[PDB]
Amino acid sequence: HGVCWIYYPDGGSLVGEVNEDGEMTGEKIAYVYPDERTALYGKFIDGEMIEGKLATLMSTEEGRPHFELMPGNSVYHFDKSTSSCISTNALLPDPYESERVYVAESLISSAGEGLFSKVAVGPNTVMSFYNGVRITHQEVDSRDWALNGNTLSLDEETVIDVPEPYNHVSKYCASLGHKANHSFTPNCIYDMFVHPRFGPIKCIRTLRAVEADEELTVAYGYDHSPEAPEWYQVELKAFQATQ
């Protein structure tokens, strides 16, 4: 009975007893979110989630965790996106994200919908996930801006996107990172995240304390000249003329 905890740089972790081979394989393995309380407990094979049920890490004694299942039939599994598939269940929300953010009309004029915090949290808090289909930089950079409203660079090889009609919450709510609007004085940043369901993606993490019902914003970081959507260039000029 040698319990192992594997923590990712983002704060999440994998915990459980390894098999004879030394791999996270069994019916009692769990992924614990960055709040070190919300968890997905169940069947995992070599650390990969096969059937995780929503649970709560009640306590830990000498490294041994005690989980209690949450009511309901909420099960999740590794479901990495491809270039054409965003999710096997687009309407199944993420439990950790669901308790921290919500979509509403943005406070930014003519910005459509925005992402808002459900709670007061301190600096460096993961609030939302930015999952989407995986496409190349060439495909993205070689097409009109009209189609790049939700593109986010993951790494040098991959760009995450939430293309129509998934940009509508009625069509896709597995993750909500794409709903955060831009600001040159953002309260959040896009950060790397290793998700048990979405795999390697990015998350929205606070830069500082945020209050309940405060709109979450991130700096989109488009190239600037002392190419970007017109609305962006406009706000850029307006920003330079205050401060």
Binding site: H137, W145, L152, Y220, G221, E227
Partner: peptide, 7 residues
Amino acid sequence: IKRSKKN
């Protein structure tokens, strides 16, 4: 040229 968000 890069038409995606970056950080």
